[PDB]
Amino acid sequence: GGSRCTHLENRDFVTGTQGTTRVTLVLELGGCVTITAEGKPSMDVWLDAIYQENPAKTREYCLHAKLSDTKVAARCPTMGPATLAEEHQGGTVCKRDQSDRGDGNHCGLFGKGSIVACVKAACEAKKKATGHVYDANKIVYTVKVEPHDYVAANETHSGRKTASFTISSEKTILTMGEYGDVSLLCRVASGVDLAQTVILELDKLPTAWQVHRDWFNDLALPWKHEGAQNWNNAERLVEFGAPHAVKMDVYNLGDQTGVLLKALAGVPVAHIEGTKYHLKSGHVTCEVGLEKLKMKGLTYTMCDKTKFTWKRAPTDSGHDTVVMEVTFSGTKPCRIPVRAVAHGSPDVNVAMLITPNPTIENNGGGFIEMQLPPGDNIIYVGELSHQWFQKGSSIGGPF
Amino acid sequence: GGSRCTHLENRDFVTGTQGTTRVTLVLELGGCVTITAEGKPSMDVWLDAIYQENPAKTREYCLHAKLSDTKVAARCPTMGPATLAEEHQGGTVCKRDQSDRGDGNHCGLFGKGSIVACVKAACEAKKKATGHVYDANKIVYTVKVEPHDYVAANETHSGRKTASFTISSEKTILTMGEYGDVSLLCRVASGVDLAQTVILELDKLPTAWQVHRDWFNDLALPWKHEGAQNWNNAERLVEFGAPHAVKMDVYNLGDQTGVLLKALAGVPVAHIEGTKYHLKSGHVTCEVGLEKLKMKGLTYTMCDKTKFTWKRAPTDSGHDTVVMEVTFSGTKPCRIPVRAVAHGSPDVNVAMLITPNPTIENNGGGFIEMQLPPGDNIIYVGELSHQWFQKGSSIGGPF
Amino acid sequence: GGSRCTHLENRDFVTGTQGTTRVTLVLELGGCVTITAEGKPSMDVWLDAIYQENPAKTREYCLHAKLSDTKVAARCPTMGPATLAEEHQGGTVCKRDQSDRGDGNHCGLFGKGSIVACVKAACEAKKKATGHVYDANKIVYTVKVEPHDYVAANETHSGRKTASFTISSEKTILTMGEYGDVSLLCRVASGVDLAQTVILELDKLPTAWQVHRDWFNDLALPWKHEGAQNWNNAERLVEFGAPHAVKMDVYNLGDQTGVLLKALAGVPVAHIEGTKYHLKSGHVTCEVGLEKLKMKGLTYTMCDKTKFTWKRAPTDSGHDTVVMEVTFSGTKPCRIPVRAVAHGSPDVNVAMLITPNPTIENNGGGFIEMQLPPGDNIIYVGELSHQWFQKGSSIGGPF
Amino acid sequence: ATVRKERDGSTVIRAEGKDAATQVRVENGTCVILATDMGSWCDDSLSYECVTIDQGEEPVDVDCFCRNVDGVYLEYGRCG
Amino acid sequence: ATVRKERDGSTVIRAEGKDAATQVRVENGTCVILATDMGSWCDDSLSYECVTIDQGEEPVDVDCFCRNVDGVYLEYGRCG
Amino acid sequence: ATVRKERDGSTVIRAEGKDAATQVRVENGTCVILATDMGSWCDDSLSYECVTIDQGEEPVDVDCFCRNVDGVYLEYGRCG
């Protein structure tokens, strides 16, 4: 088996005079809570997924330019200026210079003549760095509730109830079988600052990343929008040669996918399940309204501080948070005594836990996710300790 | 008459041992809730308006350039470079080229001479595409409470109490007459992702739109800021001609208001009431604190699934949500059984309701507002169904 | 002494049938609340600090360019184009023009020759306008609770408990001595719209400011990123001279720190405590879960409307809010009757209070912080009045 | 067409659409206007040099030329 | 190399890497190709003028020149 | 002013404000400095060519000229 589901505490709910019970739940991504009533079967409530189905395409950058139909026009020093039809056309890069002219290139007077070279600038197939922006109100927070048996893939779980939430959508009523009609009011909260977030995706090893807004907008590469035929700032990959009598060569600066991947090393990888653009960080704080029932609350005792060992040493989660796993040898179940101090002051708690109630359960438990301030810090799990260095906030590598 | 006001359910409130009652309300824009106490008159609580009074001017784009005082300066091939006073002046577009010179234009030596043409670039009257950015903390959420009679325009409603809220301002105490002192704690939530929002307004048919941040910043038009005299990137509407002996003509690229309106087709229209910049989407979740009273709660029964018909078929609201109206022939009042499934899986609810409690009331009711995932979906109102195709997230048309 | 701490009201908490007490607190920055239980000592709960430890460097602007190793290359009118190694090098500004050539500069044919001048463009020491972007989820909201005595600097306060919160981290359990285990669920809310916020900092009188995103990104100055060696758009401070036979001089446009400071006049000053980037505006709304105790609630009576005088007249706080101090001559303690009306309608309350419960306490009290709509408004503190003109939303001065 | 002495040493001719393919007398010499893109006077106006060509010299790539009079310019509005 | 009359009055020569340092007959005259940066025909192609130089005139700073034939251009793909 | 042979074939003269309107001997010839925008040596330095003008040829639009010595350049700091 192995269930992380945390039993409901007495402090989390209040029973009114008129028989109404207001159960307050903190549901992180993957985090489960067991709610039980006197005589009614145990129900597991959890936040299943945080995602946005196919978000808007902001900017698409060209990594490798597709140059075609290059034309060079030139005239004698006494004759008029050299002109091309591509100069007043879209998706073309043109350069105007002066070429040395004489009798060797058939011109009556020795001097400088007008020369212009134009090339149709486009993008090579499967060589685009597309960007995606999240719409805060469009992100779905799937909350699922099932009884505390295994059922096949095609068949559905008996008693399973699905309730999706957003910033705009907050209240829904569920017919939770034995519990009757329950009012679910789930407050949505993202674990990623969506405002300063862009999903950099390459045409189909990682091919999608969660990059910063400021890093993305300042990429020195030709860009365009979803629907546009031509490329803006196409000269970023076009290099013109020296102007000869009637010839002016055009050079491609080459592929920039390798230059991009080097700067994208260490950048948090984006999670795309088909069309669903998932966010691996975030939570949902719900307030369940129950009627005509007595709630069964189980308050936790503190775990033995001396009986703790590291199952998995504190490491980076991959979304600016710290993850750790602990092994407890004492009596189960209990509440994990977890805190942290910044190197210098050992009396002020600096731990900002993502896990609302870290507990050692009868079956499983022991997973702790937390936020720590930058610099050298010491994480304490009772008597058990570990030094962690949190890296400072960054937008990305230089380009 | 016709009131949409939904009666308070037993699940929404809890009565304490010390006599305190905590009533939890979900108030969407236009959405009303009726709160009643034993012996006290019924009170209608609703969110009246979501707006920001005259937000900050970000960027102002020029649609039609006002060209004036064009000057052309030229010198012989042996003489020094041609100079103009406007070259080192603000709000001017200058181009440097080579002109063919000889005896026909009075120059001792046949060759190429220096030529420069300068034009004072400004904007034509009533031809500006001004942008406005919302300050999340400055948006007012007006909450009004009145007794459940008609009063004149100049005269005020007896018993009406107004309470405005923001992200910063959350707690206020109202002297709700018969109910005494009530503590209102309203949590503010926008229905629009303000971070990726710009209000594109034209000088005074729609003249204001709610455009995306990324679409607005990448507009290929000359721009400036509120207070600046000169225009940045003014060459975007200025086209210089071929360089003749002493003449170089300047051409205006014309009006771009028509090009903008074509790209703005289908874009959600902005709502401006004088100086108030309204947001037609959003809600406010309040927690009312009452003392020395017994609350009257009326729990709803489910409506008859077979007795439903479409008053107004599911359509786009105009702010990325789906609106629908239903007609019920059975017994009133009741709670609307509304759900939705994505084409493929008919067991998972994909409906994300904006309306917290859709109900068929004695007088009115039957309005349902909801969020749906992109693609082909089927909306269910009991037995009554309708297929809806939600369009994918977009920033706007190409420019 | 002088304590602003506001005693807990009966409306703010509810005692359940099973003995659980849910205390709801509104904690603004600096704002304190006194929570007391029957037989247990009084505890002062307050929001100590709102900050982010060293946020990400977005863009760094150069105010004074450091020009070095200027090289000029020129060739005769019949000879090939003039080339320099610095043209295809990073962090260099190059200009190509035509120079008058003849026998006086040793050239066989009279005409126009190719000339190119290159300069290594960098930034002068301590002359950078660095920008910082806040990560909404990384901002720490320090909540402290101590008993209602003075202790030394090195020694710690007996009974003091620290609990830090973010958008991601919301639930923590505190062992509040006599009160036992208390569940703290603090909802984080910023007083600044972080999405449209950039911290403009100069190299070490104010040296740090809270500027708007749109104002910062449109600064006409050479820019680069944290880690980059070269400067983008370096030509913004480089002015090339007239092209002579073999010489082309380069001019520096000078220091722009004085031009920046003039535009930064009136802009809200940023608060940096070493590495902590503080936000002087914001609040935290908590829901304390208590067990096995009886809560002592003290409900306030309204202050005498006629007995009010201004201690400090309404003025700008320095973070888009209005601050005021009042003196009360009547009986203490009581709740301040404070409201506001916009010039025209004297029946609609336009006051949006930052202070959740303004009260005249036995010792101190009388501080009122509020948000007001733009235009002429009249603030009322009972019978006592004052006219205030709130300025419209702005991004900053012109550059 | 109006002939006037500006703030500079230059002599400025302010002409309109009616002055196209006409001759105007400037000081001790004569000036010929051949500009076809002319119109009524307004803010949107183009100003350039009227080349002082020598004895019997034919004009090449120019729409304004003068004889016996030096330092002469032409200005016209394009609102017609 | 293929000789053809385009939509314009110009005569276009489509050459490849094999046509480097070779001579092609165009109408009543002859054209010489000296371009070294040649290759197989594709979308990425460069097109320029083949200067019609007079009797006994030596070519200066050009890789394509023609005799007795006017208005002649050269095009080649760079996919080799 | 200091005369030196660089990494290239060019002969470089490093002069200051005192070297304005003075003559320096370079190899078998002589070099004349007329630059007025000179100063003390620093990072902010301008470098250009000193044109080798023929027998009795007068200098036109140049502040540095040399006689009997070819491939000669001048460099000076602008920190004065």
PDB file of C-alpha atoms in Angstrom, chain B residues 139-213:
ATOM      1  CA  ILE B 139      -9.383  48.002  -7.542  1.00  0.00           C
ATOM      2  CA  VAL B 140     -12.561  48.766  -5.491  1.00  0.00           C
ATOM      3  CA  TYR B 141     -15.067  45.924  -4.720  1.00  0.00           C
ATOM      4  CA  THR B 142     -18.309  47.688  -3.654  1.00  0.00           C
ATOM      5  CA  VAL B 143     -20.464  45.492  -1.336  1.00  0.00           C
ATOM      6  CA  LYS B 144     -24.014  46.786  -0.633  1.00  0.00           C
ATOM      7  CA  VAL B 145     -26.640  45.548   1.875  1.00  0.00           C
ATOM      8  CA  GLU B 146     -30.330  46.695   1.887  1.00  0.00           C
ATOM      9  CA  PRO B 147     -33.631  45.289   3.388  1.00  0.00           C
ATOM     10  CA  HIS B 148     -35.695  42.847   1.239  1.00  0.00           C
ATOM     11  CA  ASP B 149     -40.158  49.044  -2.048  1.00  0.00           C
ATOM     12  CA  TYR B 150     -38.944  51.599  -4.647  1.00  0.00           C
ATOM     13  CA  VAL B 151     -37.334  55.011  -3.881  1.00  0.00           C
ATOM     14  CA  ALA B 152     -36.592  58.017  -6.247  1.00  0.00           C
ATOM     15  CA  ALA B 153     -33.190  58.906  -7.883  1.00  0.00           C
ATOM     16  CA  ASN B 154     -32.193  61.856  -5.593  1.00  0.00           C
ATOM     17  CA  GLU B 155     -33.543  60.176  -2.394  1.00  0.00           C
ATOM     18  CA  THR B 156     -31.530  57.367  -0.691  1.00  0.00           C
ATOM     19  CA  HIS B 157     -32.704  53.791   0.138  1.00  0.00           C
ATOM     20  CA  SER B 158     -33.661  53.398   3.841  1.00  0.00           C
ATOM     21  CA  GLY B 159     -31.475  50.725   5.474  1.00  0.00           C
ATOM     22  CA  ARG B 160     -28.892  50.637   2.621  1.00  0.00           C
ATOM     23  CA  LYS B 161     -25.255  50.212   3.802  1.00  0.00           C
ATOM     24  CA  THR B 162     -22.188  50.508   1.501  1.00  0.00           C
ATOM     25  CA  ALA B 163     -18.818  48.788   2.214  1.00  0.00           C
ATOM     26  CA  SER B 164     -15.906  49.018  -0.289  1.00  0.00           C
ATOM     27  CA  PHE B 165     -13.003  46.495  -0.277  1.00  0.00           C
ATOM     28  CA  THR B 166      -9.537  45.989  -1.901  1.00  0.00           C
ATOM     29  CA  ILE B 167      -6.625  43.481  -1.501  1.00  0.00           C
ATOM     30  CA  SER B 168      -5.161  45.723   1.285  1.00  0.00           C
ATOM     31  CA  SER B 169      -8.532  46.764   2.898  1.00  0.00           C
ATOM     32  CA  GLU B 170     -10.366  43.654   4.184  1.00  0.00           C
ATOM     33  CA  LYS B 171     -12.125  44.322   7.552  1.00  0.00           C
ATOM     34  CA  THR B 172     -14.952  46.852   8.297  1.00  0.00           C
ATOM     35  CA  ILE B 173     -17.753  47.001  10.937  1.00  0.00           C
ATOM     36  CA  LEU B 174     -21.317  47.858   9.762  1.00  0.00           C
ATOM     37  CA  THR B 175     -24.207  49.078  11.967  1.00  0.00           C
ATOM     38  CA  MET B 176     -26.832  46.945  10.126  1.00  0.00           C
ATOM     39  CA  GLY B 177     -29.818  48.442  12.045  1.00  0.00           C
ATOM     40  CA  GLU B 178     -31.843  45.602  13.665  1.00  0.00           C
ATOM     41  CA  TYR B 179     -28.818  43.222  13.396  1.00  0.00           C
ATOM     42  CA  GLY B 180     -26.613  45.695  15.333  1.00  0.00           C
ATOM     43  CA  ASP B 181     -22.834  45.801  14.786  1.00  0.00           C
ATOM     44  CA  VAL B 182     -21.710  43.210  12.178  1.00  0.00           C
ATOM     45  CA  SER B 183     -18.043  42.483  11.296  1.00  0.00           C
ATOM     46  CA  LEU B 184     -17.557  42.177   7.509  1.00  0.00           C
ATOM     47  CA  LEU B 185     -14.364  40.414   6.354  1.00  0.00           C
ATOM     48  CA  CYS B 186     -14.488  40.311   2.523  1.00  0.00           C
ATOM     49  CA  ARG B 187     -11.703  38.514   0.604  1.00  0.00           C
ATOM     50  CA  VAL B 188     -11.168  40.238  -2.773  1.00  0.00           C
ATOM     51  CA  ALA B 189     -10.600  38.159  -5.985  1.00  0.00           C
ATOM     52  CA  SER B 190     -10.361  39.399  -9.616  1.00  0.00           C
ATOM     53  CA  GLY B 191     -11.907  37.466 -12.519  1.00  0.00           C
ATOM     54  CA  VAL B 192      -9.240  38.906 -14.885  1.00  0.00           C
ATOM     55  CA  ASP B 193      -5.445  38.200 -14.680  1.00  0.00           C
ATOM     56  CA  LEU B 194      -4.575  41.944 -14.240  1.00  0.00           C
ATOM     57  CA  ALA B 195      -0.801  41.262 -14.630  1.00  0.00           C
ATOM     58  CA  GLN B 196      -1.268  40.316 -18.334  1.00  0.00           C
ATOM     59  CA  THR B 197      -3.955  43.028 -18.895  1.00  0.00           C
ATOM     60  CA  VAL B 198      -3.777  46.456 -20.669  1.00  0.00           C
ATOM     61  CA  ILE B 199      -6.789  48.736 -21.442  1.00  0.00           C
ATOM     62  CA  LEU B 200      -6.356  49.959 -25.062  1.00  0.00           C
ATOM     63  CA  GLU B 201      -8.417  53.173 -25.380  1.00  0.00           C
ATOM     64  CA  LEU B 202      -8.882  55.473 -28.421  1.00  0.00           C
ATOM     65  CA  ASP B 203      -9.679  59.234 -28.275  1.00  0.00           C
ATOM     66  CA  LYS B 204     -13.454  59.985 -28.255  1.00  0.00           C
ATOM     67  CA  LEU B 205     -19.246  51.959 -31.360  1.00  0.00           C
ATOM     68  CA  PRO B 206     -16.420  50.510 -29.158  1.00  0.00           C
ATOM     69  CA  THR B 207     -13.439  52.803 -28.353  1.00  0.00           C
ATOM     70  CA  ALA B 208     -11.970  50.762 -25.420  1.00  0.00           C
ATOM     71  CA  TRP B 209     -10.720  47.120 -25.237  1.00  0.00           C
ATOM     72  CA  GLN B 210      -9.205  44.669 -22.699  1.00  0.00           C
ATOM     73  CA  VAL B 211      -5.983  43.591 -24.525  1.00  0.00           C
ATOM     74  CA  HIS B 212      -3.106  41.282 -23.447  1.00  0.00           C
ATOM     75  CA  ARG B 213       0.195  42.795 -22.129  1.00  0.00           C
TER      76      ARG B 213
END
